[PDB]
């Protein structure tokens, strides 16, 4: 066979240990899921420093906790901007999931609260910047470099999916680089606890699985498709379904055709053909052997999965950091003062937040 005696036994034992870890992780998750936290701070506890990023509903700002001096990333959502039904439900998903999970590559939520106008989620500040800007600056990552980041996403999805959580917005914009060069996944605005299928049409066009575009009830395998898109974009410098307008992107996704740069290794192309698989009976991550079809693929043969989890692999890139609060690894954004109305807005819609 492909493995000899010692290799096969080591792999089997490793896979059983994963099962044991995930069973304990589920117990811990459910305790926090059953009894969440809320109202653990207020706005005047923080000095607002700089906008780190923007989105449809608000912004993420670097803030400084006045009492401790610790820096954090504060996501501010304008309750009135969270207009549509699925926008509301998604925001409650995001807070509840973030407060309950615990994994080395998932950003940590420290405080949550709301006021008359906004919702606030105060998270760990990750000073190395977005993968997105490093990737666009260098062009493309080498295959070993891409593989180091991909391995962290594989483990993170193995963790989330074991909890019946789907992530649904993988892309380089949502992946922050920490001081050790490892990944922190942020933006759980599209994460959801799903036991089987779900039906919301949501995500980012380039990263959408065909079953989402086709208005089919879909499952966690959409995250494995998105991993294929991410690995392709990291290694090529552009994603596999690439067009100026979303409708054109959607047409390419559903076609079942992908072309690869001539510099892609054959191992990489084989992995990507099995992730970017329109037939769900054939897509890696969705088969009888689950995540192990990915973890045991030839392209990951050099990956020490436990060492990645323990953060003991030398990162390909260590961000430059000049001290706490340094924002040199982030792009600049237009600053807009934070206004809090005298009247409570959308109080009933966000009771649970």
């Amino acid at each position: 066979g492909h493995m000899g005696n010692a290799a096969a036994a080591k792999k089997g034992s490793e896979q059983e240990s994963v099962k044991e870890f995930l069973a304990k992780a589920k117990e811990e998750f459910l305790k926090k899921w059953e009894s969440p936290s809320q109202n653990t701070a207020q706005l005047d506890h923080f000095d607002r420093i700089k906008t780190l990023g923007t989105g449809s509903f608000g912004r993420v700002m670097l803030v400084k906790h006045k009492e401790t001096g610790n820096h954090y990333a504060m996501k501010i959502l304008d309750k009135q901007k969270v207009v549509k039904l699925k926008q509301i439900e998604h925001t409650l998903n995001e807070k509840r999931i973030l407060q309950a999970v615990n994994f080395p590559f998932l950003v940590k939520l420290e405080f949550s609260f709301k006021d008359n106008s906004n919702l606030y989620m105060v998270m760990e500040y990750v000073p190395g910047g977005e993968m997105f800007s490093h990737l666009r600056r260098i062009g493309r990552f080498s295959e070993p470099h891409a593989r180091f980041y991909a391995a962290q996403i594989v483990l993170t999805f193995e963790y989330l999916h074991s909890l019946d959580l789907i992530y649904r917005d993988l892309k380089p914009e949502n992946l922050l680089i920490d001081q050790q060069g490892y990944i922190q996944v942020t933006d759980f605005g599209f994460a959801k606890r799903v036991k089987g299928r779900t039906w919301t049409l949501c995500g980012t066009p380039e990263y959408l699985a065909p079953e989402i575009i086709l208005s089919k009830g879909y499952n966690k395998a959409v995250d494995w498709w998105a991993l294929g898109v991410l690995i392709y974009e990291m290694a090529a410098g552009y994603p596999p379904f690439f067009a100026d307008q979303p409708i054109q992107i959607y047409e390419k996704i559903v076609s079942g055709k992908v072309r690869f740069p001539s510099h892609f290794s054959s191992d990489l192309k084989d992995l990507l053909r099995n992730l970017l698989q329109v037939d769900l009976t054939k897509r890696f991550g969705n088969l009888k052997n689950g995540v192990n079809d990915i973890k045991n693929h030839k392209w990951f043969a050099t990956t020490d999965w436990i060492a990645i989890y323990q953060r003991k692999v030398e990162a390909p890139f260590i961000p430059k950091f000049k001290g706490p609060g340094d924002t040199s690894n982030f792009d600049d954004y237009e600053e807009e003062e934070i206004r809090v109305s005298i009247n409570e807005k959308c109080g009933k819609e966000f009771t649970e937040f």
């Binding site: 989105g55 549509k84 699925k86 914009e173 949501c202 067009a243 100026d244």
Partner: peptide, 13 residues
Amino acid sequence: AGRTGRRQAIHDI
């Protein structure tokens, strides 16, 4: 040709 800047997620459609 395609989108090179940051990409916004869509909540519907």
